[PDB]
Amino acid sequence: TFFAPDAVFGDRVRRFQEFLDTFTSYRDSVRSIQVYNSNNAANYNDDQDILPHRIIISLDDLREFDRSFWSGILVEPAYFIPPAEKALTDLADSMDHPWKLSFKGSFGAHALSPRTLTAQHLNKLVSVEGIVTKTSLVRPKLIRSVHYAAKTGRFHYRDYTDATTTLTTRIPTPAIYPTEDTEGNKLTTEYGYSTFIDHQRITVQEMPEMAPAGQLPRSIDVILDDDLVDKTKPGDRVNVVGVFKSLGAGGMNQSNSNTLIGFKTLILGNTVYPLHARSTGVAARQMLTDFDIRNINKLSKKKDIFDILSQSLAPSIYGHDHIKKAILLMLMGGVEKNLENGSHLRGDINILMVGDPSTAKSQLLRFVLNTASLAIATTGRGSSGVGLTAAVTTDRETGERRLEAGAMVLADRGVVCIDEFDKMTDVDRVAIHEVMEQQTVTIAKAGIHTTLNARCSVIAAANPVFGQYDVNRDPHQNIALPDSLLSRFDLLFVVTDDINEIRDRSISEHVLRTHRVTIPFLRKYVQYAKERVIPQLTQEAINVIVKNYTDLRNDDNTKKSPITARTLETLIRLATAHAKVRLSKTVNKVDAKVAANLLRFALL
């Protein structure tokens, strides 16, 4: 007997036992965790000769099970969480350790931002969201010691506790780190058998998209635990569900007190979820039921789907099919081939638009900013620290210099949507030269010489030099950002403003009826097209791009400028991407025809 607990604790354990045996999915989840760790242990104990312990409980069911247990948890959680955890360890031990819970909700009008937190909400269960800054370092915490004795040869043992334990209180008893037992003998300690459990604390500010007009922000701080270390990098957007504990003696202990108001507050646990934002953080968690992949397989084998998905990104924009084809070929992105003992070769596609004003060149990039995943938009400026980190760190614990990522490091595997590309000064264009082929960013400022990684994809939309004169004088510097910047870009779409009468009609009823295939299927098509499967190139497609490339040199070197081997490499990239679209494995002549036609319309 610990303290031979009361029949109240028996009442809570029996009732929650009845609920957990009422709905029977959770038993199957426990069975899945237990079998998976079992067979992993069989692989690690049989050939050569991980998953945590928590069950996600939703608060849907308890509202239709018991009002008492429902409104019991959301008011006083230090009386209702340790019984339910005790019964769940009873079930998991009986079917074949902590076994914590989650409480995914649906929360009870406790959806509050940390502006309105304190203080009559104290010691309840509260859900908080916001930005994460300024995440500290990971340190291990000690729980159990083990000592070897000399010379009698008996191990020993000791426990340790704290105030950030299970959620009740306890009359504290400190305990010296032992040495020289009775009778007097040296106790040489040991490691490897003495346990350790990790520990980390992060602080949370309220959202800037939700904040007031201009005021100072106000923030709280969260302690994490064993299986929650290192989920959220600083800069994310994070939902936290926990218990708003208030520990410490607030200066009422000793008289003539300083630290005028004590009772410092924090949040324990419990279930940090990262969530999707508009501009930072992955959204690849989107579900794929078997109905959905069965429908993808149903539409997967047609012969017009490139012309269906061409006209899918334009629900309300007239014309410009070939731009849409280029944007889908960007979102598929090609394949990445890293060599053995050399340098890798680049996979994606880079697109520049240029043309007259009022041509929906800025309306398009917001649409690519919505449908894709990890889009980051930079307009104008810029300096300092888009392509770099600027290294401004003043770490308080010790003299050390960290890095704070800009816009180029953070958008990895993503899309960067730059507007007004001519307004950039050349000093940042040095950094764009460093990104767009070298695929690395070397920073050796004060400092620490590093070489991190960033392999983004770039879309820009620049204005002409003077007027709308896109065809009048010559193509030779209507753009005027020479010359390597013209060569790094794959495609150069040149958009004009022709005047007609039929074009005025077709624009007219489109714009008029707009004031009065579907995309959340289309991105589920996209990610399944991306992870499976990479194609290989075959013999049927070499000679088309070889003959086509010698054609483009021997004649387009008589028409226009410039042509490098980078054109050949982008031919291979668009061939691979159009092979990815049809969910195939090999490469056909059809792909070389389509990419050939796109490069014809792009250049000529």
Binding site: Y160, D162, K337, L452
Partner: protein, 689 residues
């Protein structure tokens, strides 16, 4: 005692493991006689300081004993689980048996030897005096030994040691042959549940500090009683002590007073550094972390900054927490002890052996036509430009410096520019040759500041104080410093580079520095022409944004044209598409040399120092009369480049001396200097088409 600080039993025994470790220490025959009597006799003969106890001989001993009968107690996993107790247990297993007298002491040997000799001899005479006293007071002889051995205070055997002891982890090869202790981990992977084991990391060393002595035991004298009161120090800070703690100045009225001395303590070198994450093993959106390393003993001075290393050591705690208001008890803040250091990219010229090496080198020598094969081998995955690869092999060889007794020094080194734009694949060569050569640093245009690639001054944590933290150029000396986009550099950086063009020198007169640091580097540059590209209407140096003085400091200058031509395009297309189709280019009939064996060849080649002769004097002189003669009859700003400075003469003797080393001959001949004049006249003057 029960009921407070209780007990636990575990399967681990420390009884038969000591006996088995004795049996392993004596009887191991595999590598004249046994293995450890030879090395341990070599230790007691005072010509050696460390002992490498691997983890392969133990495992082979367990399979041997497992097949002989009887069953052998599992010991390798017992080392891998705990790995801290076994240095002391193993080392007091060594000390029972040692082949002592094998050589008399030299007079001029050392001071640590003679101190440990007097401690040993005094210990013997003290132990014999008491049995010369009690034995004459009577009243098999094991009992009298047990009497004398417990009424006499002695120097404990923790202090008369003279050596150190280092483990060594097991390969994948030995674990593959018979079927973990060394899986190469990353710094993100080290969970807080490995504290005590024996692990292996990899990363780039940054900020390695100085070597300064740290104390282990401190030796006082008592001046009245005559004792020597020791004291061990485990912590960071210690405190001195007072009157006495002997058995004679205690239990008396008049205690003495003690004060320390430094020729009787025991010191140990000490040096700490940091491992940063390798930046290839990172997730998609993260930043490299770090993790400290202490280094004790013989292993010091083997951690050069800016490398790629495989440190294997054990992983302990060391008590601290940060601000006082953030502590929850009993947060611990880990580090990594070092045991054995293995580098990738092994550094010349830290090698001596030749016998086994010729089994690989003489295959390349007996392969026939070594030179054009190696010229093919550097970055094979591009097409064309055999002459550029041809010159850059001569960059990697280099040599040979010369002191003329004044002493003014000459170089000794080659400096190469690259010109032309954009699709001649010049960045691939810079990443390539700044990956073959050890100690090679690749910095872009902007990029580093002026203070980034010169040194700066910053305060140093724990070891003190005020060390000059190096920049890019001080990091990569006796190496190759690749540079991208040379035109966009700030003008202060230009004068820094011009100061590197004169040898050894960067001079600083900023706010806290008056120094003249050293740099023996080699510079490869890559400048772009004026926009857009290559107008033969435009003159040379019109399309170049650099003065001809800087053109004169480069002894070898190139230019890579870009002219559309019908015949090469099919070979280029079949080349590139042949690798996107596969992952290896060459065929019919050639294999690429692996880069490790190539670095063994070039690392072998730099120990020759060839010597010129008298016929090459005539030929070099007359060729210089040719170049000097026709170079100054034009005098124009045309496609000609005036005026063929004598830096070309020193550079062409230096290229001859570089080509002579790859024959490995000290046989400077006419094919040498003829080859050099070929690379000079073909080097430039490619802008005719």
């Amino acid at each position: 005692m029960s009921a407070a600080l209780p007990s636990i039993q575990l399967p681990v025994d420390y009884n038969n493991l000591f006996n088995e470790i004795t049996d392993f220490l004596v009887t191991f025959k595999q590598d004249k006689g046994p293995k450890y009597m030879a090395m341990l006799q070599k230790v007691a003969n005072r010509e050696l300081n460390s002992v490498i106890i691997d983890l392969d001989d133990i495992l082979q001993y367990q399979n041997e004993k497992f097949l002989q009968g009887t069953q052998a107690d599992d010991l390798v996993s017992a080392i891998q689980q705990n790995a801290n107790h076994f240095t002391e247990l193993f080392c007091r297993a060594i000390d029972n048996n040692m082949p002592l007298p094998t050589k008399e002491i030299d007079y001029k040997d050392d001071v640590l030897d003679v101190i440990l000799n007097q401690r040993r001899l005094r210990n013997e005479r003290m132990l014999s005096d008491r049995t010369n006293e009690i034995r004459s007071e009577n009243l098999m002889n094991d009992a009298l030994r047990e009497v004398v051995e417990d009424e006499t205070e002695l120097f404990p055997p923790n202090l008369t040691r003279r050596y150190f002891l280092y483990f060594k982890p097991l390969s994948q090869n030995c674990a593959r042959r018979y079927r973990i202790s060394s899986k190469p981990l990353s710094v993100r992977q080290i969970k807080g549940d490995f504290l005590g084991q024996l692990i292996t990391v990899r990363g780039i060393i940054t900020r390695v500090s100085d070597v300064k002595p740290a104390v282990e035991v401190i030796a006082y004298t008592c001046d009245q009683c005559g004792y020597e009161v020791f004291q061990e120090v485990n912590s960071r800070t210690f405190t001195p002590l007072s009157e006495c703690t002997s058995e004679e100045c205690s239990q008396n009225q008049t205690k003495g007073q003690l004060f320390m001395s430094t020729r009787a303590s025991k010191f140990s070198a000490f040096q700490e550094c940091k491992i940063q994450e390798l930046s290839q093993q990172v997730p998609v959106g993260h930043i490299p972390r770090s993790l400290n390393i202490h280094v004790n003993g013989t292993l010091v001075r083997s951690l050069s900054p800016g490398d790629i290393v495989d440190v294997t050591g054990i992983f302990l705690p060391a008590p601290y927490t940060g601000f006082k208001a953030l502590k929850a008890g009993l947060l611990t803040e880990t580090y990594l002890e070092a045991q054995f250091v293995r580098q990738h990219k092994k550094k010349f010229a830290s090698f001596s052996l030749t016998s086994d090496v010729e089994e690989r080198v003489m295959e390349l020598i007996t392969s026939g036509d070594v030179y054009n094969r190696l010229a093919k081998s550097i970055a094979p995955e591009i097409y064309g430009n055999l002459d550029v690869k041809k010159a850059l092999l001569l960059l990697l060889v280099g040599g040979v410096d010369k002191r003329v007794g004044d002493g003014m020094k000459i170089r000794g080194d080659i400096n190469v520019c690259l010109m032309g734009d954009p699709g001649v694949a010049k960045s691939q060569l810079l990443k390539a040759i700044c990956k073959i050569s050890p100690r090679g640093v690749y910095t872009t245009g902007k990029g580093s500041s002026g203070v980034g690639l010169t040194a700066a001054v910053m305060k140093d944590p724990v070891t003190d104080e005020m060390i000059l933290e190096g920049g890019a150029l001080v990091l990569a000396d006796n190496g190759i410093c690749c540079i991208d986009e040379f035109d966009k550099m700030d003008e202060s950086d230009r004068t820094a580079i011009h100061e590197v063009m004169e040898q050894q020198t960067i001079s600083i007169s900023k706010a806290g520095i008056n120094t003249t640091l050293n740099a023996r580097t080699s510079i490869l540059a890559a400048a772009n022409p004026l926009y857009g590209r290559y107008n033969p209407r435009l003159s040379p140096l019109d399309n170049i944004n650099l003065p001809a003085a800087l053109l004169s400091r480069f002894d070898i200058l190139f230019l890579m044209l870009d002219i559309p031509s019908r015949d090469d395009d099919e070979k280029l297309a079949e080349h590139v598409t042949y690798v996107h189709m596969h992952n290896k280019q060459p065929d019919l009939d050639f294999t690429p040399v692996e880069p490790s064996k190539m670095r063994e060849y070039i690392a072998y080649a730099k120990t020759k120092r060839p010597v010129m002769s008298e016929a090459v004097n005539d030929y070099v002189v007359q060729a210089y009369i040719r170049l000097r003669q026709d170079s100054k009859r034009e005098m124009d700003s045309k496609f000609s480049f005036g005026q063929a400075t004598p830096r070309t003469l020193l550079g062409i003797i230096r290229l001859s001396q570089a080509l002579a080393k790859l024959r490995l001959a000290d046989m400077v001949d006419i094919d040498d200097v003829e080859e050099a004049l070929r690379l000079v006249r073909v080097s430039k003057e490619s802008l005719y088409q």
